[PDB]
C-alpha cells in the first residue's frame, strides 16, 4: 500500500512535531500560582414549574432571562431576578435535549429527537409566540443548537454531521461532515465564526462555519464526549466524557492541556460551562452534583450540593453574576 | 414593595405556573410504552395492526398510550435511551423466522440496563401462520445445535421463549411478559392493556411498602 503508508506516516510525524515542540504541562508553570480556596456557593432562588427531567438551559444575552427544556414538552422563559415565568412555550415533540436563546432576545429555537430544529419568535405583534421556521432535513437526533445571528443557526445531530442553516430561506447552506459517530454537543465561538463539536467516537473537531472546512481534530478520551464549551476568550474549549473526565484542548497547541478527573468520581460528565473570567470550570456530573473546578489547578474548589437527581445542564451569565443548574428533579437553582 | 406593573407580572407568573401544573398533571395521565426491536422485527406490523423518533398516540378503554418508536434512530449508540426512564413498560418485538441470536443479545442488553432495571418488558411474537410452516425444513439447530427436543411448533417455540427469558438476569424486581397468539385476531392490544394494568398496580403497591 502507498496511500495508507503516507497517511500513517503523516499522522505519526505531525504528532512527533507536536511532541518535540511541546515545552511542558501547564501545571509545571502555574504551580506557584496561589489557589482560590473554597467557593462555597449558596442557592439564592429555586425555579419550580417544570414537571419533567430538565435537559438544557441557556442564559440570556442580558444576563437576566433563562430558557429551560424538559421531557414535559415545555420550553419556559424565566426571569432570574424575581423567579417569574415570562413565557411558556408548548412544543410539539417532547423529546427535547437542547435549545438556546438568541443573542438579540428575538428568537428561541428548540427541538430534539424528531430531527427538526424548530425556531420560535417572541417579540411578535400579537403578544404570543409562534414558530418562525422549522429546520428539517436531518436523519438523526439533534443536539446543541446555537444561534449565530437572527438568520444563522448551527446544529449538531446523530447523523455524525453538523449543518449551518439559513433561517430565512430554510435550507442547509453548509454541511460539516467528518465524524464517525453521533455529534451530541457543540458550542459557538465568542466571535461567532468558529465552533467545536464533540462526537460519540471520543473525538472533537474544530469546524469553520464559513467555508465548511474541518480545521482541527481532537482526541484523548476513551468514550463519547458529553459536553463541550468555549473558554470565554475563544481560544480554548473543554470537554466532558462518560469517562468521568473533563478535558481542556487548546485550538492552537492541538493537544489536551489538562484532564479534570478525580478518583472518587464514579460516573461521567453531562454538561460543562465556564465563568466569565474563565477561572471556574463548572461541570454537571451524573451522580447528583455539580463540581466547581479551578481551570488552572484542576482542584474541586467547591461543590454545588442539591439536585437529588443527575445534573444535565449548566450555564453562566454573560456577566458571570450567576450560575443556573438543572437536574432531572425538574428544579433549576441559581447559585451565588 | 411591588411597583404597579410588578403586581401584574406576578399575576401572569401565577397564571403560567397554574397552566404548567395542569399540563404536567395531564402529562402524568398517559402511558409511555417505549418500543424497540431489531431490523424487520415487525415493529411496523405492530404499529399498523394496533389501534427520527416517531410518536403514536392512541387511547384504549379510557386510557391514553404514547408509544415511541426509536427504530428510526440510525445510530445504535444508546445516547437517547436514558431519556425513556419511567416508561410504564417497553415492547420488545421479534419473529421466529442468525437473526435470533442478535435478538437474544439485544434483549439481554435491554434487560441489563441500569435505567430499565425496574421497568418490566413485554415481548410479542404474534405472527403465527408462518412460524410453523417453515419449521418442517429444519429444527432450532440451523445455528442453535443445543436444542434436543422434538421438532414441533409447540415445543420449539416454548424452548425459544424459555431461552429468551433466561436472559433475565434479575427477576426479583423486574418481570417479563410474552405473547404468541396469531397477529390477525385483535388480541394484541388487550395484552398491552393487561400488562400495563398489572405493572401500574405493582408500581402502586410497591410505593406503599405493602409489597
Amino acid at each position: 500500500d502507498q496511500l495508507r503508508q503516507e497517511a500513517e506516516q503523516l499522522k505519526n510525524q505531525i504528532r512527533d512535531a507536536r511532541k518535540a515542540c511541546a515545552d511542558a504541562t501547564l501545571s509545571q508553570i502555574t504551580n506557584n500560582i496561589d489557589p482560590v480556596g473554597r467557593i462555597q456557593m449558596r442557592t439564592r432562588r429555586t425555579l419550580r414549574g417544570h414537571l419533567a427531567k430538565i435537559y438544557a438551559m441557556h442564559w440570556g444575552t442580558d444576563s437576566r432571562l433563562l430558557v429551560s427544556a424538559s421531557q414535559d414538552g415545555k420550553l419556559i422563559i424565566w426571569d432570574s431576578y424575581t423567579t417569574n415565568k415570562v413565557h411558556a412555550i408548548p412544543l410539539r415533540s417532547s423529546w427535547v435535549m437542547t435549545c438556546a436563546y438568541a443573542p438579540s432576545g428575538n428568537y428561541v429555537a428548540c427541538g430534539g429527537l424528531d430531527n427538526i430544529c424548530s425556531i420560535y419568535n417572541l417579540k411578535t405583534r400579537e403578544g404570543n409566540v409562534r414558530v418562525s421556521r422549522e429546520l428539517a432535513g436531518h436523519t438523526g437526533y439533534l443536539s446543541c443548537c446555537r444561534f449565530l445571528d437572527d438568520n444563522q443557526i448551527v446544529t449538531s445531530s446523530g447523523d455524525t454531521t453538523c449543518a449551518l442553516w439559513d433561517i430565512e430561506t430554510g435550507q442547509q447552506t453548509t454541511t460539516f461532515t467528518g465524524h464517525t459517530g453521533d455529534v451530541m454537543s457543540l458550542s459557538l465561538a465568542p466571535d461567532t465564526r468558529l465552533f467545536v463539536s464533540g462526537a460519540c467516537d471520543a473525538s472533537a473537531k474544530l469546524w469553520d462555519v464559513r467555508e465548511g472546512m474541518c480545521r482541527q481534530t481532537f482526541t484523548g478520551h476513551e468514550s463519547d464526549i458529553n459536553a463541550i464549551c468555549f473558554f470565554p476568550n475563544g481560544n480554548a474549549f473543554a470537554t466532558g466524557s462518560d469517562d468521568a473526565t473533563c478535558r481542556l484542548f487548546d485550538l492552537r497547541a492541538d493537544q489536551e492541556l489538562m484532564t479534570y478527573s478525580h478518583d472518587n468520581i464514579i460516573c461521567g460528565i453531562t454538561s460543562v460551562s465556564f465563568s466569565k473570567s474563565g477561572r471556574l470550570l463548572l461541570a454537571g456530573y451524573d451522580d447528583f452534583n455539580c463540581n466547581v473546578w479551578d481551570a488552572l489547578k484542576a482542584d474541586r474548589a467547591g461543590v454545588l450540593a442539591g439536585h437529588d437527581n443527575r445534573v444535565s445542564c449548566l450555564g453562566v451569565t454573560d456577566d458571570g453574576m450567576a450560575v443556573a443548574t438543572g437536574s432531572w428533579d425538574s428544579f433549576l437553582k441559581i447559585w451565588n | 414593595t411591588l411597583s404597579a406593573e410588578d403586581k401584574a407580572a406576578v399575576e401572569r407568573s401565577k397564571m403560567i405556573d397554574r397552566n404548567l401544573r395542569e399540563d404536567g398533571e395531564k402529562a402524568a395521565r398517559e402511558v409511555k410504552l417505549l418500543l424497540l426491536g431489531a431490523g424487520e422485527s415487525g415493529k411496523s406490523t405492530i404499529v399498523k395492526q394496533m389501534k427520527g423518533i416517531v410518536e403514536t398516540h392512541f387511547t384504549f378503554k379510557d386510557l391514553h398510550f404514547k408509544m415511541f418508536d426509536v427504530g428510526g434512530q440510525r445510530s445504535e449508540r444508546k445516547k437517547w435511551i436514558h431519556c425513556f426512564e419511567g416508561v410504564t413498560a417497553i415492547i420488545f418485538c421479534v419473529a421466529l423466522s442468525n437473526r435470533m441470536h442478535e435478538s437474544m443479545k439485544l434483549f439481554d442488553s435491554i434487560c441489563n440496563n441500569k435505567w430499565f432495571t425496574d421497568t418490566s418488558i413485554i415481548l410479542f411474537l404474534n405472527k403465527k401462520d408462518l412460524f410453523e410452516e417453515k419449521i418442517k425444513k429444519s429444527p432450532l439447530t440451523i445455528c442453535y445445535p443445543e436444542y434436543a427436543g422434538s421438532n414441533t411448533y409447540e415445543e420449539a417455540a416454548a424452548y425459544i421463549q424459555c431461552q429468551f427469558e433466561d436472559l433475565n438476569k434479575r427477576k426479583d424486581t423486574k418481570e417479563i411478559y410474552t405473547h404468541f397468539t396469531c397477529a390477525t385476531d385483535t388480541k394484541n392490544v388487550q395484552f398491552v392493556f393487561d400488562a400495563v394494568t398489572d405493572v401500574i398496580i405493582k408500581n402502586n403497591l410497591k410505593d406503599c411498602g405493602l409489597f
Partner: single-chain antibody
Amino acid sequence: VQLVESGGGLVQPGGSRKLSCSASGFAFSSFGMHWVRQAPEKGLEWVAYISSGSGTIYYADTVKGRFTISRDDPKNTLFLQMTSLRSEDTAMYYCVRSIYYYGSSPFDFWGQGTTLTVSSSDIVMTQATSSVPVTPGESVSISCRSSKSLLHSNGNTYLYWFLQRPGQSPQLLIYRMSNLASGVPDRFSGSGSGTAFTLTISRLEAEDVGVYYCMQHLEYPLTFGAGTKLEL
C-alpha cells in the same frame, strides 16, 4: 391589530349607556385592557383598568364605584357599562390594550375610540404650555413636571409619551423614559431625572404635529398631563 368600539351616541343625564370594545388581530386573552377618555378639547383622562384574566380591577376616583368593567376572553369583547351619567362624562372614549411582563410596552396600541355625549394624594402632571408654533426641520423639546419622583426602587421611571394627531387616536412614543415604541421612527427621544421629564424631537417633519401628552404609571389612578400642542 384592530381595536374598534361602539355604543356611542347622545344620552340624557341619569341614564345608563354601555360601551363595547371588539378586538381582532391579537391574543386578547393575555392583554390587560384599559379604558381612557378624552373630554372635548381638554385632554386625556384615565377611567378604569382590568388585568389579564379579570384578576385585578381599578377605577379612577372620580367615578370609582359607578362604572363597571366586564371581560369576555372566549369572545374577545371588552365592555364598559356606566350607571349614572352627569354632564362630565361627555368625552371621547378610547380602548387601550396592555401586556405587563419584563420589557413590554403595555400602552402601545390605542383603539379608534367612541365619542359619548351627555346633555346638560393623586399624582399631578403639569404640562408647561398648550400651543407651540414651529416649522419643519427644527428641533423641538417638550416637558412636563411631576408631583412625586416617578423613579421606583426597581430603577424604572414610569412615564409614557404619546401623540394625538388631529382627527386620529393617540399613539405611543416612549413607554418608560427612553424606550422607543413599536414602529415609531427612531427620531423621537426622551430624557429627564426625578421630576423633570422632557421629549426631544429633532429634524421635525409635517406629520409630527398634534396634541402631545405625558401619562404616568407607578400608581392608580393614572393621571394624564394637560397636553402640549405643536402648531405650524
